[PDB]
Structure formats: C-alpha cells, structure tokens
Nucleic acid binder design. Structure first.
Lengths: 121, 158, 104, 217, 75, 290
RNA sequence: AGCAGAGUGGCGCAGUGGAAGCGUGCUGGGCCCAUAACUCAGAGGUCCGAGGAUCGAAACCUUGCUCUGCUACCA
RNA sequence: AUCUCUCAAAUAAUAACGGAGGUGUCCCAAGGCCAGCUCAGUGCGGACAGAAACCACACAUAGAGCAAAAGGGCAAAUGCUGACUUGAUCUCGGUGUUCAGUACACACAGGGACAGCAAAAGCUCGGCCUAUCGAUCCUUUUGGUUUAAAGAGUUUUUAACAAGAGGUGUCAGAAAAGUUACCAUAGGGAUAACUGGCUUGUGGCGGCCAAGCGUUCAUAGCGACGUCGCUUUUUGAUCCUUCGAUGUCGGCUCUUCCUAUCAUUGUGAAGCAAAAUUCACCAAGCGUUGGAUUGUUCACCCAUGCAAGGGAACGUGAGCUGGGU
RNA sequence: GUGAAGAAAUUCAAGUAAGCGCGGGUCAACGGCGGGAGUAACUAUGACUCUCUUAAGGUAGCCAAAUGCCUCGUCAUCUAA
RNA sequence: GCUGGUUCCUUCCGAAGUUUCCCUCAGGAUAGCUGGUGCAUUUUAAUAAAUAAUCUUAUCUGGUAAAGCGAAUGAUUAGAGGCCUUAGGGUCGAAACGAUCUUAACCUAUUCUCAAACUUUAAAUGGGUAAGAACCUUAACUUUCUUGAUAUGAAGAUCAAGGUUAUGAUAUAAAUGUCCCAGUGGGCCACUUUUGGUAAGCAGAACUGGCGCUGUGGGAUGAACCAAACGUAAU
RNA sequence: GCCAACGACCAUACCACGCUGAAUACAUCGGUUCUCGUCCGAUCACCGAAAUUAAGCAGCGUCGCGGGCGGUUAGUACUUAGAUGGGGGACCGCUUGGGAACACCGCGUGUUGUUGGCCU
C-alpha cells in the first residue's frame, strides 16, 4: 500500500486459532485484564465478539524483559453444536434464522454467566 | 480484412445460450452411434479440446468412424462448384442426434404392420405419404347464432 | 528466463527405456574446410568474377531458435530437439522460489 | 466545423455509439431536458400535450435548445412561470462524422486528398421514428390556448411537416383521463411526483394492507 | 491501382451451369483414415464365414451340450 | 439487496445442492470408451453414515443407473455382528458379502474363491483361462478423501479377497507406513480381525469403568469382552462364504396412503377463499374502530 | 501525417523502476563602522493531464494538454 | 505475411489507405496430473487501527483469476495453495482451417512404444481454445555403427541417406543507393497539370418564425438564437473524353448575351418637412470611365462624375503582345 | 619462409611488413560560427547578472540587398496619386 | 509483359472479366466457364422396386429486423418515498448527545429517452440430412482383438418372412475419363440490402437479374428502361 | 404415503419466511488409543453411542421473489415475392404469404429410475 513501507508477502504478523478445553481458561485470564463488565461494542450481530488489550504480561506469566511488551487483540467465537453443517465436507447446508445467533444471544451469555454488564456507553 | 484463420466469427455461435453454462450434462457422454446412424455437427462451449471450425456448424452427417471418444463424419460443404465430402474428427459432446430419421423409422414399422393388417382383406395399401388436400363440400347450418356478425373497420383516429 | 533442470529422463533410442540423460549445447561448429560446398565457393572465385554466389544481408530474426543436444548418460547416445524462440537463456536453472517477497 | 444545417436531413450513416474507447468528444450543451415547475405533483397538472413529427427525419441537436428557449419565453410571458411542465423527451446520443478542414498555414501540407477518410466528432444529432413524441408540456386545463399558440413557434424550429396531438391522458402519466378517476378513488392509484402506482395488490399482503390502512385511517 | 477487385460477381451463375452434383454416388465406400485396426480385425473375421451349410448347424447341438445358457443373462 | 439477482441466477444441479455427487469424478469415472458401445463399466459404490456403511454395485445406462447389487451393515446381525457397525473389521465382511452375492447371480460360486485365510494378504486374483472371463470391478470413493487409511478401502479389501476383480494397488492401506513401506502385511490381520479396536477395549479394560459407559458402549450390555472378537468375524466369513440370504422380505404390505400424510396442496378454491377469509378480516379490523 | 521530442524546486538543468539530485536565487544568524563579497545553517517537488501493467513508475506503456522541430499536399 | 471485435443483411464465404486493437514474446512452471481449499466485493467486527495492515463471521453466480491484445469458456475448475514429476518423448501415416481442397506451418483423433502423477477409472503426443511463424542450395551437428570411392585390400578424408538447427519479416525467398532544367524511348487517358462534365463542405445567394434593437414602437429599415432552400464566377472534390498533341495565363481590339439593378423612365414605402437618402416591386433600352506602382483578376490610390454594379462559353495567339510563367 | 603434432594430404604454433584505428600538425582545404530567464525612481529597454551546453559560438562591415516566408515591411522623399 | 495490321463463304456451339501464388498490380502460369473427342449404361437406351433436381411432409439449424431497458454491459433525464446518520448548512440548544427543518449521500418504487464492437426471447427469405428392395424386421455363425464369460457387444458373411416401394412435378436425355483444349483473368447497372464521403453520371460490396455478346417493337431521342430474347416467307 | 443409497431430467426442483415430520432412517451429538491429518481430533480421521428432533433434510403453507406454462397484446410491428402505385425527396399505401416479442392477465411450484427398507 506504500503508506507504511510494508509490501506483499511480508510475514507481517502472527496469529493462531484455539478451540476446545483450552480457550475457556485463557479468556478468564483476560477478563480480569478486560475488567469483564465490557463495553457495548465490542460486539457483532453474528453472536461472536472480541476485544483488544494492552500489557499482555498480567495473565500469570513471567515478564522476561528480553521478549518485549505487546498489545493484543482477541476474538472468541461462540456457537451452537450443529454449526459445522456450513463447514462439513459433505451434505453441507446453511442455517436460517435459527439456530443462527444474534448480538443479544452473546450479550445474554456475557451477562448471565461471567456477569458482564453491557455498558451501553 | 480477415477471416483466415481459426476461430473468428463466433459471436453468438460457439458459446452457450442463456442459463446453460457451467458443468456439462452427463446424458450426452452416454450415447452410442453405429455406422449409418445419421448425426448432426453443432457447436459447444464446454469441451475445449476440439471444435468443428467456422463453416461447418449447423450441418449434419453420416458416421463412418468408431473410435475412442471421437466421431468421424461425412459432410457436404459448398465449393464453387465441386461439392465434396469432408472427414471431421470431434469429441462427442459437440454432437446432437438427427431426429430426421426418427420420424422415418416409425414410417417403416407402421407400413410393416398396416400392410400386415392389409394381409387379411387385401385392398388397399394406401401406404405412401400425402399432405392435406382440397377437402370436401359441406353444408353448414349457423347453429350458433345467425349472420351479421358485421365487423367493419373505422379505426384510424387516435 | 528459461530455467531448465540439469538432468532429465526421456526416450533413449538404444536402451528403449527411460533413463537419465545430460543436456548441452551446439555452439557454432566452425566451417571446417575443404568441404564440398567449400570446395566450390572457393572454386568459382579464383579471380575476376566477383561474388556470384550471394553472401547475405537483410537480417531478420532477433534471436535464433536454440537447440540442446540430449546426451544419454547410460549408452552415450545423443539426440536433438528445438526449444522456442527466447532471447534469454541459461542451463542449470537456478530454480524459481514461488511465493517469496523480494528481500530488503 | 459547425457545418451548415442542410447536411443531415437523412439518417443514412450508421447508428453510432458513444464509447468508452474513443477519446475526443466535444460537448452537447443540452443540459436541461424539462422546464416548468418540476416540483409539482400529479394533481397540479392534469392537461397534457406533445409535439410530434411524421418521418424518419433526422433532427439536429441545436433546435432542441431553441425548442427549450423559444417556448420558454412565451410561456413565462403569458400564463405564469410555474403553471406547466415542459419536457423535451429526447437525448442526442447520435454523433456526426467529420474530418475538420483546418489544413491551412502551409507547415502541415499533406493530409488528405481523400486518402484517407476517417472521422472526428464535432456535435450531435437525433434520430426520430414515425410518431416519436419529442417536445411535450404537462400543464393545467386552462392553458390549452396558451401552450399550442406558443407551440407554433417551436414547430417552426423542428423541420418539415409536424402534426399536433392533444392527449386524452391525465398529464404525463400512462393513464387516460377518464380512466384516471375511478381507480384513484380507493387505493389502486398511489400518488408520486410525476406518476402513480399501478396495482399494489401483488404483493403479498401487507403493502395492500398498509394501503388499506391509511385510506381508512 | 484501385479499379474494382475482390468480387464474387457472376461467379455463382457460372457454377450452376454444370449442376451442383453431390460427389458421385457409391455403395461400398472406402475405409481409410479410421482406427487403423479395428479394420484388420475384420480381416480375421473376413476369413471366418466358411459355412453356409456344413458348420452352421454343428454348433447348435453343442449349444445344448451345456444345457443351454441360463446363467449369464446379465453379463 | 439482491432483487433481480435471482433472475440471472442459475444453479448447480440437485445433488450439488444436497451435496451428493461432484460431477467431476463420476464423469471421468464413467467415461466409457466409445469403441465399446454399451458394455457397462460396472463401478462399485461405497457410502457411509455415522451408524452404517454401505456397499453397492451399479452401472450407468442412458436413462440412469441400474444398481444390481446392494449391501448394508444391517444384514450383519444375521452374521453374529451385533455392534461396531463402522469398523474396518466391519468394513471387511461388508465387501465380502457382495463378493459372493454376485457369484450367486452369475453362477460363479465355484470359481474365483478369492483369498480364503485372510491375515492381510495383497492378493490380486488372477484372470483364469478356458472359460469365464472374470467380472471386473472399479472403485469409487464418493466424496470422501482417499487418504492412506480410509475405511472405504476396507470395503474394497473384503471385495478383493472374495474373488472380485479390481486394478488394485496397496499404497493407501492403513498400517502401511508411508515413510516408508516396509509392507507390514500383518496390520490388516489386526484391522480385519478388529484387533486395532480390540486393543482399545483392552487398553481401557482396567483404566476407566466410565470408558465402557463412553464409547465401545453396549459391549458391556451383551458381555462382549475384548478377547473373542476375531472368531465372530471368522465364523461370519465362512457363513458369508456359505450364502448371502439375498434379502428376501415378504411383509406385503402396510404402506399405501398412510395416513395421508404429507399435506396435499390446497388448490385454487381453497387458496383464494383462504385469502377471502383473510381479506374480510382486515376490513373488519377497520370497521371495529368505526 | 507518422515522428525527433520536451514540459522536474522561484528560474535553470541532472536523474535508464527502490532516492526527490545539483546549482543559483530566496530565508535566518554570525562575521561588518555599516552595505556586498565572505562563513555557518535552513527551506524549496499532483516530476504536463488521464489511464495501463505491477513488488514499486518522474523514468515503462500508450492516451490527451502545452510547445518546438521538420519537410511533404492542394474533402 | 499475419490475430481478434465488428464492418456482414441470423449457413459459411467477402471487399477499399473502413473502425477499435494486437503479435516477431514469454513459462521447469505460467508444464503434466492427483490432492485439499474457493475468489470481485461488502456488512458487523476487534490494543496501537483511517485510505491504513491482521484475524473473525455472514452475504457472497463469478461483478475475478486464467503471462500478453480482444473474444469466448471457466465455481469442490481450466483459479488459490500443496504434493510429485517430466509427454515441451521416440515412432509411423491419415485428418482439421488456409485453397488450386497443394506445400509450409498450427490444431485435432488414432495405432504402436516408453513412461509421469494419481488408490483406481482415468488424464497427459505443451501453455484453456482464436496469433506467438519458412521452402531448395549448402554450412552443420545428431545419427546405422551404415553402404559408395568402379581392379584389390587396410586406414583417414570427403561423399551420400534420416531427424532437426544456421536464413530468407519486400514473409513461398533476387545480392541492391542516388538523380537528371542536356535526358534520349515503347506506350498509357488502365494515370494527373489545362479545357468542358454531373456534386457544391467552400463561398457570392435568398426565404421563414421573431429574441431583441430601433426614445416609445417586435416587423420603417432591422432581424440574433436556430429553421430550410436555388446558382456555377472561383474553391476543392472526382478521372468520364483528348497522351499517334484541343497552342495553356494576362492585358489591348471586339461583337455579344445576363439578371440577384449602380445610376437614368413610371411608382409605392418610411422614424419621407424640404433638400438629401433608404426600402421594394417592374424594367435590359443607351450608358458604367482618363491614370501612379506592378505582369495581373482583385487589392489600394488620384480625379472626372449633379452619379462609375455584377456576370458568360477560362470568351480570344493561323488577330497580336510574350512582362511573368 | 621457420616450428610442433600427424602414416600423409592437413591441423595449429611462433610469427607478422606496409594500411585503418591509435599520437600530434593543418581551414588563402571542403564547411560550420545557439537559446534561456532576470535586470535601471514612469513605461519601454537591456549597460548588466545567472544558468545551459558545444570543435568555437556570425567578428569588422553591409541589407527588405540580384539574397527578408511574413511583403503591398516600418520612415521621409521623387509623385496630381 | 508495349502499340499498329493478323486476308474466302455458310452451318453448329458459345464464355471471360474471380479466388490463390509471383520484386506481380498493363502481363503469366492456376482452377473456373467453353469447345472438341468419343466411350459405358439404366422397363430413369433403342424394333420401374434405379436415378440425379424444386416444393411438400417431418427433423435440426443461426441472432438480422422487430423488440428490449420497470435484467446484465454501459451510458442516461426527472423528481418522489424515506428509519436515515453519509451526513453539508443550520435551527430551538454551551453543542446538542434533546429537538427541528434543510441540503448533500444512500436505498425503495419509478420515469424520459438509446446502442456498429449490449443481450433475457425472435421472425420471412436462404443453410443441412432424410422421405426404403444399396430395404425392413428374424435366426446362428463369424472375431487371430485391444473390449466382453452368453466365450455378450459391434461389424461381417448366410439362410428365414415380406404388396403394389413409400412426397409432389419432370426429364428439352442421363453417365464419365483424357486434350488441361482456343479464350479470359480492367468491367458496367438498376431495385431492395449497403459501407466510405456533405457528395456526385464517383468510389466499395453481398444476392439476384441484364449490358459487354444483342438486334429489338416502345418513353422523339438513348449499350442496360419496359414488352420480347432475332431461320426465309403470307395472314 | 414416506426413508436411504445411486442417480437421471437439472428451477414446477430456487430463495426468503413460517409450520410440521409416525416409523425406518438420515443426521445431530461424544471421545482421541490405534489408521490418520492436523496451528487447532472443529473442518478432515478413527472409535459409538448418552442426549436431540432445535437446525439440516423432507413435507407444507405465503393474492412471496423467482422461474414453468397458457391466453391476449396482434395479424399490429418487421417481412420473401410483384407493379406504368402515389410523394419534392423522406418515407408510406396496396397485391402476394409466412408472422413475432417484452410487457399485461391467468394457471402451476418437481417429475421420475432402479435398489432396498419403513410403516403413522
């Protein structure tokens, strides 16, 4: 784009995906950093949402000043079991209005458990 | 200043007419043609290894080739004037059947049967083909609504 | 640029199987006199005719259709095939690395 | 180079385009295709009238502008400024076919005896079938004597023979005047700017029902 | 020198003076340019049709030697 | 958005919507050479569900595809197999089923006996002489991926060991270590005799009682211990080699017009009057306020 | 009518796809009894317009605008 | 030579120095083929986060990509990514469009082989198809391990057959710079300068409606913006006639006819008081000049004039003149 | 002509003079002999100042010359004009 | 390869002005047309159940008119409908985050017109094959085969059954191999269809008819216009 | 009346929305030791069933979009053929016979192959 000296094929960033039996603990290590009464948006209408943090040391790790400080963004994806029909190899179909989520479904799930009030700010 | 050469002039011919693009049917990969099953040569846009070139498309022909996945035809085209035969090789999905034989074969088996019913009374064959004729001389009651019934125009002014 | 592999396995006219071959050039093979044409053009210009057989101007092609002799490694047979009209050329290949950015 | 008017009485060159391929096209100055109170509703102007010709006559771009200005000045001096809706129904997309003859001054000295004969654009023209309505006015019923007795001075800018129609439609809509009344009365004609709505029944229910609501309440 | 050229005029009329004439007509047409063999496989079978009265009926009793053909009705 | 977007749309056909074929494999599967005219190509079909794995034999014609032979895991209850209907062990006997069922159809029960004592043998059967040319068979993988170790090859394995005739290679077998064979031919003896599953019962025999409450459940409901699995297969295989029952069924019948059942489609008299039942309500909802 | 082309910092030019290049003016101070010269330092760019292709175009491409060149005919 | 889109009137074919363009390259992957996996965009998003990056989720009928122009095809591919490999192979002859149904070339289907991926069926005899290119003579490789050198060997040389390549872009193939006002020839109207001829963008030439001007007053005289029409003085056009010759530009002398009228006879109009002058109808009867420079038509003067208008067979060289040309 | 290989025709080697290139000299030898902005208490100018680039920049004199497209140049005079 | 002349009569027949190739573009070869020379033969040749050409019957075949923009591809005129929050001016407000219009965006419904290089359908004229005895069904034989166990299938030879041969209207006769046979390879015009140009008795063409080759009766006249296409004669 | 597998014709079969679904099932769901790919046992893969009829799928409803198909538009438009037919040309009127279309109105919303199996 020439605006930042960055080009094609740069290996510019790092990412990953985590699902099942490991995501539920790293999120709650972030909710104390998130002060989990989170703002309103912070939210998409798909029923999944995410946030971004500074000071990635405070989830119970050693600082180790040879590594550097890092601000991070996160995105957790909720769902309904059966959603793989859009992503299975065979007999693969869409959803409809249900069981497809809205923004309220996560906002229910954010406020019912973990008690994250919506902060309509 | 050009035809000369090899696929020029294929505006509406050689493509697929509307709402039939994408993946080929699989009916036409199944068909079978003996020697003498008279067949057509036409255009296609879904087997891009082979074509009949710019002049042929829209002509039909005999088959005297039986091969792996090809058909070799005899076909008449106009030179001025030595109208010759041509032997064209083509993958099968360019090709549709004649149905012009396909009336004539049931012109056969009726005649083998309608003579077979004629083989019990004798007369008469009546077995050739005749189009519509001068019909008759009816008399026609109204029967339905006597005459006048008078549509006479007046329509110009608008 | 035409990268080519240094080794390839093609038809060998002697072993009648596919075996590894080597590939080299043709370069020019200077006109070794006194050959049959050479003993005629040198014949008909012992003096005072002046350049009858026409020596040729009017250059046309910007590059020549290069050829590569294909020596079999096994039974030392050599063969021939053209390759298409490209100005740049190299053997060995320096194999292209797909998907990498230009460094620095 | 603004060649005289006699050279294009016949559409005999090809139906031309205006392309995204050839750059160099000059300006058609007709930036207005309708005059009068364009902010009027349909109820403001019940009357309609066109102006039409009787050939396959090619029509030049220039008298369209005269057709704009000449009937404008009569209608602003006779029956109020906003009491009509002038419409010139026609766009000159067609191009004329010119080599410009600025071959003077000596420093150039070859171009063309007639080798070769390509074209350049200088203006536009318009192509007219039989009965193609061109210049039309949507006004009230009390100015029929105003428009046609101004339409004289626009017929004598559009060439040849031209007849004059008085419509039986209710303004510029696609509906006859006596036809206009009875289907308007309940819901079936819903008013808009220059037009109405044809048959809100299909569909499927609520648009008929929302139109059912406001006419009752 | 641009006089008049390229033109197909009268040229058709002079072709329909001798009739337009589909090539000849033939019965046992040539066999060339095909599958080259297939063609010589017939050459074996062209050596095979020896019987009209002698071996044509000998196999028919040998048809019943295998009590008919009840099994292979699909293959 | 997308109003006129429906107008220029067209589809991919029907089985692409419901995700059944691909049209890319099957066309170049059933690409018959045209020199042979209508000698069938006779491919073999294997499909699978979460509870069942299926085996079909079919061929194409002009109108469609006649399916001469069929199989299910539903028949294996007649052959002593109660549970585990999605095993590679279970994959073997299913391909073994039709492998002699066709031999009853064409009468080739004697010849082409196939691989008898299976311990994981790469046995392509030989084309015999002086008589019946053997009925060839071709393999489809449907839509699943043909990776080294797919269970669809296990349906081929009982088919090729029963006497069927396939151009068959071995590099896609489970247990044949891709880096690098080293054909451990005895791994199918652990596969076909279910030992790869039977160890998992034994390696969870003493660790979790809840393991049996989890998967390989209902083996405890029938007392199926982790010892006797292969002999259930071996006794089934000779019984498969005895006779397939050719699915005789004579209920005949409780089927027809029960009960209606699927909402016959409301013709023009009950369409517009349903609208007329709905049109008069909306003027009544306005006549209520005045 | 092809074409040699050019149009870049106030002005002049240099720049063959990774940079905005040099010089003079212009701008500030020191040096001056005060002005110049002298000394240090700063500032100065839709690279003629619209597009093309691409990892990036002042340069590569053609396209129009401005402007010489440069000989030719004769809607 | 050569490629597309039209030009093309719905088979094909096809025109001009008609329109829009393109090509003499490029690629060991941009090829061969199995494997997974779907882009143009756009919505809601998410520390630093816009035109900013990156991840996520929905809508995504192809609005992309496919080396290059333009068409066409293209959706678990013919694209993205990945694996692995050389069919860009040897070989035999036919067949497709160029047309005389030739040759080159390029595609296409085989038969035989040797293989290459894929589990198989299959797919592959180069770029997804319409371009991406050449004949003898030789030079020259690669060739059987090949015959010929004519008396007989041996050995080297050349010579031959067979596949390519070095080469012919004016593309079926000569090796190729000028000008003759000293120029001498066969001829040509198949081909101009001159004279006539149909045509009129050009220009002289009127009509119409009136936006306005004319102190007021649209129309006395004017008439813009636009509307549509005749002549042949030129100005080009075109090539129809004369190339075995039509003596081709001016002025002098000199008959003539012509109205679209300058002024004289008879009127009418007016912003026509008169004098003066303008408009417009009818009207070719006599009139339309003497000079400075130039070779002139015009141009521009000086003067007469109570006042100086346009035009015709290029009017006219066996009447001249020859100043230009 | 001299060397080396080679059975030999032949293969190269060492060589290698004059020419052209290479180094100067020369135009009473052919033939050449630029533009750009800025700049003076009116304007106009350009005595000047900067920059560009060449083998060096038309110098002393002439002139719309018999030689200036623009031409029927701009200005007095000869002329009734 | 360029011009002039190329000498006796009647009878018969009667063209070319095109494609390619060529340092060709005024000429030659080339096919084309024509003429000659016979020769083989049809119950389509000698005191039809077999053909070859125009319509029918049936069957495929194309995007040109005509349309078509309330589909794409564009280009394109008018306002309207708006929660709008893209929001430009504001406004009641410290701004408004309260509220209020307006104006730019936007969507929704439309609307005026258009297309040689845009297509969702789509003509007449004209393309193409077919309208049987060289058949049509039926047997079991053949296969040295890559295919397939009926050692299927495909094609081949050979028996079995078979009406009157299968649309109309004709055939002034059909059917072929040489000489590559003399010429000719410059054309012209009208109607529609039509580019180039403002255009023309100009050029540039596709499909016919005619002129050159052709007199002729008729618009006085005039190669083409419209009647009709020319053995000697009377009506 | 359905369900599966394989299809075939490939929108009357689609999409948006709403509703239902007996059985057979299809699915959903569950685990990770081996085959096995994986950043990630979610997609893939191996094991098999606790729970489920919500979705998917099927069936149906909507003066639903869409598409199929009929009827009118309309003998209109264009048109092969013909003329001593007009018009200043432009263009149109007749004789000769083929003859449309979008719009506009209505009807319809998958038919089916074989292979099983289910039985409201």
């Amino acid at each position: 784009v020439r605006s930042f000296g960055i080009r094609r094929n740069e290996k510019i960033a790092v990412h990953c995906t985590v699902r099942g039996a490991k995501a539920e603990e790293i999120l709650e290590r972030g909710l104390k950093v998130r002060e989990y009464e989170l703002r309103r948006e912070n939210f998409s209408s798909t029923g999944n949402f995410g946030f971004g943090i500074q000071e990635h040391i405070d989830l119970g790790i050693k600082y180790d000043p040879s590594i550097g400080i890092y601000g991070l963004d996160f995105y957790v994806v909720l769902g309904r079991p059966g959603y793989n029909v859009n992503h299975r190899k065979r007999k693969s179909g869409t959803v409809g209005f249900q069981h497809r989520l809205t923004k309220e479904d996560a906002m229910k799930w954010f406020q019912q458990k973990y008690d994250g009030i919506i902060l309509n700010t | 200043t050009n035809s000369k050469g090899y696929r020029r002039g294929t505006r509406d011919m050689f493509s697929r007419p509307f709402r039939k693009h994408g993946v080929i049917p699989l009916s036409t990969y199944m068909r079978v043609f003996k020697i003498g099953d008279i067949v057509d040569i036409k255009g296609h846009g879904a087997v891009q290894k082979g074509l009949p070139y710019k002049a042929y498309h829209g002509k039909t022909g005999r088959i005297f080739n039986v091969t792996q996945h090809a058909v070799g035809v005899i076909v008449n085209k106009r030179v001025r004037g030595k109208i010759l035969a041509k032997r064209v090789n083509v993958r099968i999905e360019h090709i549709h059947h004649s149905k012009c034989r396909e009336d004539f074969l049931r012109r056969v088996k009726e005649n083998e049967r309608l003579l077979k019913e004629a083989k019990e009374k004798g007369q008469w064959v009546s077995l050739k083909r005749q189009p519509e004729q001068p019909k008759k001389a009816h008399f026609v009651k109204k029967l339905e609504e006597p005459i006048a019934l008078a549509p006479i125009p007046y329509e110009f002014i608008a | 640029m035409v990268n080519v592999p240094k080794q390839r396995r093609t038809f060998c006219k002697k072993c009648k199987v596919h075996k590894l071959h080597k590939v080299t050039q043709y370069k020019k093979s200077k006109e070794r006199k006194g050959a049959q044409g050479r003993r005629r053009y040198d014949r008909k210009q012992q003096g005072f005719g002046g350049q009858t057989k026409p020596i040729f101007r009017k250059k046309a092609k910007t590059t020549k259709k290069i050829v590569l002799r294909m020596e079999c490694t096994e039974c030392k047979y050599r063969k021939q095939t053209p390759l298409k009209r490209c100005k740049h050329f190299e053997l060995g290949g320096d194999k292209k690395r797909k998907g990498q950015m230009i460094q620095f | 180079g603004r060649r005289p008017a006699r050279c294009y009485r016949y559409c005999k060159n090809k139906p031309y385009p205006k392309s995204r391929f050839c750059r160099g096209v000059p300006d058609p100055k007709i930036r207005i295709f309708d005059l009068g109170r364009k902010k009027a509703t349909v109820e403001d102007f019940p009357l309609c009238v066109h102006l039409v010709s009787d050939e396959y006559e090619q029509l030049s771009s220039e008298a369209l502008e005269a057709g704009r200005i000449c009937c404008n000045k009569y209608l602003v001096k006779y029956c109020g400024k906003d009491q009509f809706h002038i419409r010139m129904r026609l766009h000159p997309f067609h191009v004329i076919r010119i080599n410009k003859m600025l071959s003077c001054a000596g420093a150039d000295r070859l171009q063309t005896g007639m080798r070769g004969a390509f074209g350049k654009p200088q203006g536009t023209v318009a192509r007219v079938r039989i009965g193609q309505p061109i210049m039309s006015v949507r006004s009230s019923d009390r100015y029929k004597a105003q428009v046609i007795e101004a339409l004289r001075r626009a017929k004598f800018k559009f060439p040849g023979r031209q007849k004059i129609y008085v419509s039986k439609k209710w303004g510029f809509t696609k509906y006859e005047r006596e036809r206009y009344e009875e289907l308007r009365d309940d819901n079936r004609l819903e008013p808009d700017g220059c037009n109405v709505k044809y048959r809100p029944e299909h569909g499927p229910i609520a648009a008929w029902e929302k139109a059912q609501r406001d006419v009752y309440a | 020198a641009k006089s008049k050229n390229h033109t197909n005029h009268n040229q058709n009329k002079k072709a329909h003076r001798n009739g337009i004439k589909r090539p000849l007509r033939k019965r046992h047409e040539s066999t060339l340019g095909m599958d080259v063999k297939f063609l010589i496989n017939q050459r074996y079978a062209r050596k095979g049709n020896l019987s009209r009265e002698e071996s044509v009926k000998r196999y028919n009793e040998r048809i019943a030697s295998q009590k008919g053909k009840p099994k292979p009705v699909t293959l | 958005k997308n109003k006129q977007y429906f107008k220029r749309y067209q589809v991919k056909f029907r089985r692409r919507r419901e995700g059944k074929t691909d049209y890319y494999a099957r066309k170049r599967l059933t690409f018959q050479d045209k020199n042979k005219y209508n000698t069938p190509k006779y491919r073999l079909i294997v499909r699978l569900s979460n509870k069942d794995i299926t085996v079909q034999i079919a061929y194409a014609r002009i109108e469609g595809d006649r399916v001469v032979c069929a199989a299910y895991s539903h028949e294996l209850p007649k052959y002593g197999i109660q549970v585990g209907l999605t095993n590679y062990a279970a994959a073997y006997c299913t391909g073994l089923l039709v492998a002699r069922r066709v031999l009853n159809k064409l009468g080739l029960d004697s010849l082409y006996a196939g691989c008898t004592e299976v311990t994981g043998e790469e046995f392509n059967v030989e084309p015999v002489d002086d008589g019946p040319g053997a009925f060839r068979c071709f393999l489809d993988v449907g839509l699943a991926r043909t990776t080294t170790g797919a269970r669809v090859f296990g349906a081929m394995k009982g088919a090729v060991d029963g006497g069927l005739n396939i151009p068959h290679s071995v590099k896609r077998f489970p247990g044949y270590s891709a880096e690098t064979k080293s054909f451990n031919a005895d791994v199918h003896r652990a596969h076909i005799f279910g030992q790869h599953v039977a160890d998992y019962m034994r390696s969870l025999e003493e660790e979790d009682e809840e393991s049996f409450k989890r998967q390989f459940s209902r083996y405890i409901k029938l007392g199926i211990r982790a010892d006797d699995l292969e002999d259930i297969y071996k006794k089934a295989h000779q019984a498969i080699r005895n006779d397939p029952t050719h699915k005789v069924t004579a209920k005949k019948s409780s089927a027809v017009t029960k009960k209606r059942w699927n909402a016959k489609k409301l013709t023009n008299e009950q369409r517009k009057t349903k609208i007329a039942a709905h049109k008069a309500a909306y003027v009544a909802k306005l006549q209520s306020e005045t």
